[PDB]
């Protein structure tokens, strides 16, 4: 007899199509507040428009709130990076935005030495066996 034990498929973002990881970016600023001056300038300066033109798969919200200025960004996986751009200037804000866009939403994490690849595919060659070795031990 053969019985099936249930399972589900794992998504590999880039193998078929590629969904773009960043989805929404919210430029948050304040009219009053010297910390939010750079942000304001950025908003003014057609740079935002240019960015929009470049990257239409990602939407730019523009909120008005009383605190420090922010760039909260929302990703496919669900997670949300948030960068407070306190007291930055236009270029720095732009750089921050770029950084946000580039990243996948995934959490930061310490890598060990040489941990490069991350597969969910069973080894093409088998896992070594002492009995199926080409050279026996002694």
């Amino acid at each position: 007899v053969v019985k099936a034990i249930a399972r589900n498929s794992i998504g590999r973002n880039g193998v078929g199509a590629f969904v773009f990881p960043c989805r929404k970016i919210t430029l948050q600023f304040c009219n009053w507040g010297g910390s939010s001056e750079g942000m304001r300038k950025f908003l003014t300066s057609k740079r935002l428009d240019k960015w929009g033109q470049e990257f239409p798969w990602i939407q730019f919200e523009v909120m008005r709130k009383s605190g420090h200025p922010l760039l909260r960004a929302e990703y496919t996986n669900g997670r949300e990076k948030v960068i407070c751009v306190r007291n930055l200037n236009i270029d720095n804000v732009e750089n921050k935005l770029k950084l946000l866009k580039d990243s996948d939403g995934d959490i930061l994490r310490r890598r060990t030495k040489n941990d490069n690849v991350e597969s969910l595919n069973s080894s093409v060659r088998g896992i070594w066996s002492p009995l199926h070795a080409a050279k026996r031990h002694r």
Binding site: L48, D49, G52, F55, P56, I58, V62
Partner: protein
Amino acid sequence: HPFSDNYASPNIYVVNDVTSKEQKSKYDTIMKEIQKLEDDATRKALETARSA
């Protein structure tokens, strides 16, 4: 003072800055109106019942 029109692109938009006080006030007013209405209707019904 930016608007969604200013950004020459569909993806960019500006969420409306409606003060969280004004909104609240509006809500309150609406509630009051509802109270005036429904309650009035109820009163009318009661009156009708009393009549016959």
